[PDB]
Every structure is written in C-alpha cells, then in structure tokens.
C-alpha cells in the first residue's frame, strides 16, 4: 500500500584517537579491567586500589588537545548516591566504597557527573584516572561476614 | 501507419501514513541522515552509533496497524555479505561493520532480507530501527591508515 | 431533388505491429492500467510509481524499426502546464505531480509534446515508458486533507 | 410495319447544391476517398479511422435547408448484417468492423437504412459523417494472419 | 380544263403491338416523359438519371419477335456530335451530356444511328432503354452559372 526509498550513508573517520588500551572485549561488552581491592578481614584500616586488568594496568594514551569528559555510572547496588558492594551468598552484607579521579584521592567522582580530565592529553600513555578507596567509617558493622563481594560500573569517555 | 488511443488514469490516496520524518530531500534522492560513528584511531574497542541527521534524530512515526517491512541493501563496497568502508584516498584500507534492527544490537540485518519491524506502530514517533556497531575482530590489521572512510546504503520501507 | 452515388472502400493491413499489451477494453475506451502511487500522509518525501494494470505491468512489445512517438495529454485538472490531482470530496485540496519518459526520471514529458521513444523497438516486450514522481516542493501546504485523489490522462502512440 | 414519333426533353437545374468535394472520378465510378485504418498486428485495442482521400479530407459543403439522407450499402463480404474485411491472399481470414454517423461513434449506421444527417447544412464545408471503428470483440480469433484486407461500400446521398 | 378521278384507300391493322405506355399526348406531339437530372451546383461528380414521366416510369411493353430499332435525334443545341444543354436566361452557359441504351451506361447512342434493342421483346413491360449521364470532364468551366438548363430530343421507334 506504500513504499519509500532513501539512502542513509555511513561515515567513519580515522585520526584523532584517545582510545583505551589493555582492555579486552568479549562480545561487545568492552571490559576495562577490574578494581581489585584484595583480601582483608574485619576492615578497620583504609584500603587503596587501582584499576588493573590482566597483564598490564589500564592506560589512556589520549590525543593532543581534545579535552575529554569522564562519566562513571552508579553501581548496580546503590543507595543514597554511594556505591555499594553486595555478597554473592548473603544479600544483607554490604561494604561501602568511594572512587576518585586522581592519585591523591582528593577529588571525588559523583554519579552521572562528567569530570574534565584534560591532563591525560599529549599521549604518553598515562594511567587511567580511576582510583578507589575503602574507609572504615559508616561501614555498617565494622566486621562483616565472609564472601566475595562484587560490583560493576559503567565508565563513559566523551570528547 | 498506425495510431492507438487510450487513457491511463492516476490515483493517489491520503490516509494511513507511516512516513519518515526529519529527512531532507535534495533532488529526489530522499536522504535520511547519516550513520556517524565518530573519530577514532587504532580501533580496538567496540564503537556504537545511531542514524542521526542534521538537527534531530531520524524517527518513524508510523500508522496504526500496517505491519511494515524494512529492507537494507548491501553497501557499494561489499564482499562476502559483509558491508565495508573504503577510504577516499587509499583504496586498500578497509573497515568492516555490522548493522542491527534493535537498540540492544542483538538482531542482525542481512542484505536484501526484509525485517518485520511491527513494533514501530501506534505513532509516538519512535526512533528508526537502524543501529550500527564496529567490532575489532577480523578488521584486517588492527590499526588502519588515516582518512575519512565512507559508505552509502539503500533503505526501503514497504508496507 | 438530387442523388449522388459513390463507393468509399475500406482497407486494413496486418503486419508491422507495435501494439500495447495487458490493457483491458470496456466500451472502446481502451484503458491502459493505472498510475497507483499508493497510500501516504503528510507527504514530505519523494514517491515513485509506475503504470501497473490488473495482473501484469503494461508493456509495449513494439515492432522492428518504426520509430514511434508518445504524446501525453494534460490532466483534467491542470493549471500552468503542471498536472494536478483533485479530491473527490473537497475541491480545494490538490497535489501536484510530474511524469517522465525514462526509469531514471530525468527526461520530463511536456503536455501535447511528442516524445521520440525509439528504444522500445526490436520487440522484447519492454515496459512502457511512463513513470510518475511526486516531489514535496511547491505542493501547496505540506500536509493535505484526507481523501482519494484521482486524475486521468490521454496517452497517444503515433508511428 | 410501324413507326412512332415522340420527344423526350432533358432538363437540368443549377442552384441548391450539397455536392461532395475532394472526390476524384475515374470512369463515372465517382470514388470518395478511402477508410484507411492503418497497420496493426494482433488486434486487441480499438482502432479508429475516418474517410480520407488523396490530398484532403472528404467534406460535404451542403446547401442551406434541404434535409438530406445518407444510405450506406453493406459490403461485398457481409454476413449477418455486419460488414467484413477479407484478405486478398487467404479467403478464410476475416476482420469485422462497424461504421458510425458521428464523431463520437455513438450512432450506428445500419445496412440499407437512411440516416437523417441534417446538421451538415449551412455550408461551412463540414467533414462527411462517416467514421469507422474496429473493436477486438467477436473478431474470430484475436490474432489474424498477414495480408492486406480490403472492402468497398456504396454511399448514396439523397435529398 | 381537266379532271382526274381516283380512289386512294386507307388501311390500318390491329395486331402486333410494341407501343409505348405512360406517355401523354397534348396536340399530336406525343410526349414521352422527361430526363430529369435533378438539382446540383458546381458539378464535379457524375450524375445519373432515367426517363421518368408524370406518375410512372416510361416502359416499352413490346410484342413478341419484331426486332425494333431505336433512333435518337441530336438536340436542338448541338455541336460536334455531342448534345448540349443551354440556359433559358444566359446563352453562353452550357453543360454537355451523354445518353446510353443500357442500364450499365456502357453502350453509347450516336446521333441519327439506329440501335437494335431486340431484348425488350416478349412483353413484360420492360423499362425504355434510354439512360443519361453527365460526366464532369470537358464541361467547359467546372462551375457554371445559375439557371434551368433545358433540351429536347426526338425519339423514333421503327420496327
């Protein structure tokens, strides 16, 4: 009863880069390592960790200029704007954690808020600005149960 | 030595619609936007893009009922049933890409094969079901040369 | 008061043909199909159609040699040399349309102007050179009212 | 053995005319043109023709008043009151045809039946009311053989 | 101075007939109808007429056997052996005409030359063998003036 004809056209340009390195892809998921905090018990001291994946650390290796933006989604298990970790065995146990955009862990990254990380330019393959820290305050009870707590984020680089 | 007389008669009906919106026409070509993947270098991560044209995204705004059919022709530079992109400067460089009929990019669109996209009905001006993805597997060498790769399709809506 | 006697004589020759096929005749009208554009609403994209009648497409199947001439009369509802379509319900609504003598729709057919379509010779039953196109420019208001717009032509083949 | 004497007396009057024009005479036959239908093959569409002879069309140019009568004899090859055409090579092949007294071809002329064509008066040299049409119904088989079919009539004008 | 005496004797026999019918007599003139050609203007087509008088056509109704002879005198206005017609108003205008002894108008009747019309025998009241035809060749100028052209013959039947 009708018919419309049109052409779309597809264009892609190779040039200015700023693409992540040392990140494996399985099925288009585009995984970018893991924030491995390590093994501890009865957390009463601050623990620091950085995004490490398989062989080598995740790096940026951005292009000259091109001030980018980093956006980190809240975790699957979130409440009150603070990302959480939930055990795979017991649903009640939970550990809170924070994430920072600098090595000194002074600038906090908020959920769904872009961060102007413009210092990763000029190549040089600098480490990705994503550092986590667990502080033993407000961590429900100081001593949690046993398990393997896990959580996943969603990191977006726009430029 | 001869003469034949006859009348043809031309009929057009306005009513049930299901016509594309936000698509400019120049000379009867009836262009429908562009699949702009963006700028990258040394493609090693999956890149997603959607059909965007000038001011606003391409939409359908189909009519009630009228289960339509979407057919996408293979590109000008094709081999083995997979659409390709070819540089305007160097003929050797090529990047493969795929196209999907859903946002999740789970249903693949084959060349010259109709797709029963019946969920775009009831108006509401839903986005056109045409999404592309570039996966860094089988992309000849992982790092291509520089240029502005281009390709054009031929989208047909029958209903 | 007077009387004159004379003989006229009637002659018809069967031989060189070049006669239309797939065209029904009712009462000597000698109908030759219909230019069915289809169903649309708020025409903003170019629509193409070809002369189709009942079971099969209208064809020529002309004879060897015999360079013919195609003449298309202006429609019943015409103004300024451009053929129009008028609704059967509301007299004000009108859609303009054009007609072409080739598949590419590059050569326009003017009213009461013969066209030397000499490429339809050597039999082979080629499709009749009559293609229509509706372009959404100068179409009064872009969105018309509802109805079943109709128009009739008068196609003459002389050779 | 006998002898009778008498005078006959011959009278002719010049005045009111209504005499045919553009008609050559050879030996008193008083020919009045030809109904040339043209060249066709596999007649499936209606063909129209008018009485044309040598340089110009046959005309009447009748006198004021003087309501005349037109009588057309049946052809040499006739059967069932319908005039026929017979090939000069094969006797079996035959095409039927009709004749009309008006341009619209709505009033049929019957064999040996006068027609009151009173509208050809007031001079003005109007075209002779004799039009033929071949309709592809009841034409034996739709496709005839090759040849030059011919037939002759006998037109009488009485007034 | 003298005187002679003698008897003549008058004899008439009734029997074998072959006498004309449908012919009025006024004063011994013994008129036999009229060759009424009719009314025409600008004679360019052959005109035929037969000897008709008052109520009915002139007939012979001859007797059995008795091969008769028909002799037709030249007209009052004759020149070169061809009978002519002269207007009663203008003496210059003239139309030539011929006369024939058969219906087909193939056998010409010459002035003062007997014709052996032996086929009118056996009664049956056959039409008189006298037919006239006007041919538009050598008729001075093709278009004559107005008037009522007349001429009289002298028909003799000897047997």
Numbering used by the authors:
A (entry chain E), B (entry chain D), C (entry chain A), D (entry chain B), E (entry chain C): 24 to 182
Source paper text:
Chaperone-Usher Pathway (CUP) pili are among the most widely distributed and best-characterized adhesins in Gram-negative bacteria. In the assembled pilus, each pilin subunit provides its N-terminal β-strand to the following subunit to complete its Ig-like fold in a process termed donor-strand complementation. The best-characterized archaic CUP pili include the CupE system in P. aeruginosa and the Csu system in Acinetobacter baumannii. Archaic CUP pili are crucial for the formation of biofilms, which play an important role in persistent and chronic infections.
